[PDB]
Symmetry: C2
Subunit: 200 residues, 2 copies
């Protein structure tokens, strides 16, 4: 009965493949996956309500151990018919003229976006906000709007492309979390190992 | 030149609201849009407090101060990947669920609540090997395995690698509804949105 929790960005590109592979390898293990804020993941782990979590550094809880997983970098994600979809990379200043669909303020990703946009002197117009990554992706594929999301998400979807931002806007280190000195089951350990191999 | 605050229950995020909002935006680019998926209860509550302009959920509505407009009928289907053994059929007997290993939404979702209730009622107790608090995650799991899930048939249409198999005796059918607080006049945008919502279901 492996209980997994991840911050919202991972749901859109990381966890699906990994869990599918794990299930295929170990069909007898019942899986539970929940996406939620990092704070809630850290708290639930402390209370042994979860076996493994996936979030970002820095971890706020001392009783938790963090193992670097990968680097997540924000890109301008657009549909193939977007004017900028022709480039592989674009200058950060381009954001000024972009009409964006973004995740709402309760998402850590949106918080970081605002902070670093402010820091870089960028204030693009946000015409649409949604509290769902899937909703944002749907909106971008059907319009000429763009969004700011981890580049890894575009790879998962055909009609979407991730445009790297010249001076990068946001880079974060994804981490695997587990409560220290509270030992793991064979399934949990296998899962952690699989998560690392996939990122190797 | 105004704003439009929309709320919808989870299933609509996966097939209905995306196309509708994209069309609305294209038609009225000057209107700022805000979309939030949440439980029906929270949608009804927020509407009563004028914290939303329009909501989409299901009958029956519990709040008297809200007006409901029938939108469409949502029926649960067995959603599988094209390589699923049953993907060859367009319809299967409900008894098939017994042998299915399912990936379902967790207990906090009304959709899961209804699934459990009607399965119990029909004398069906399929094995649930994976639970997730996200429709997207469920879909990704189904695409990559030979498991199946129970979701609105309309979702499969949106995804190529997925097929919705109709259930002989249906399992669950719900009336989707548009919600707006009565006697509290709507903006031009809100009214336009409602009309567009209906046209797309016409």
């Amino acid at each position: 009965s492996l209980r997994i929790a991840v911050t919202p960005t991972f749901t859109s590109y990381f966890i699906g493949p990994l869990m599918a592979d794990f299930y295929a390898r170990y069909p007898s293990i019942t899986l539970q996956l929940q996406e939620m804020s990092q704070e809630k993941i850290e708290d639930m782990l402390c209370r042994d309500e979860l076996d493994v979590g996936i979030a970002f550094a820095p971890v706020h809880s001392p009783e938790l151990e963090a193992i670097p997983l990968l680097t997540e970098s924000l890109a301008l994600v657009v549909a193939q018919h977007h004017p900028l979809a022709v480039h592989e990379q674009v200058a950060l200043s381009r954001l000024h003229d972009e009409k964006l669909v973004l995740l709402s303020a309760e998402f850590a990703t949106r918080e970081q976006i605002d902070h670093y946009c402010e820091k870089a002197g960028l204030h693009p117009q946000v015409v649409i906000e949604a509290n769902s990554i899937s909703a944002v992706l749907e909106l971008i594929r059907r319009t000429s709007l763009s969004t700011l999301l981890p580049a890894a998400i575009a790879t998962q979807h055909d009609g979407l492309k991730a445009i790297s931002l010249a001076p990068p806007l946001l880079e974060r280190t994804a981490v695997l979390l587990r409560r220290k000195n509270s030992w793991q089951t064979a399934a949990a350990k296998a899962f952690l190992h699989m998560a690392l191999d996939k990122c190797a």
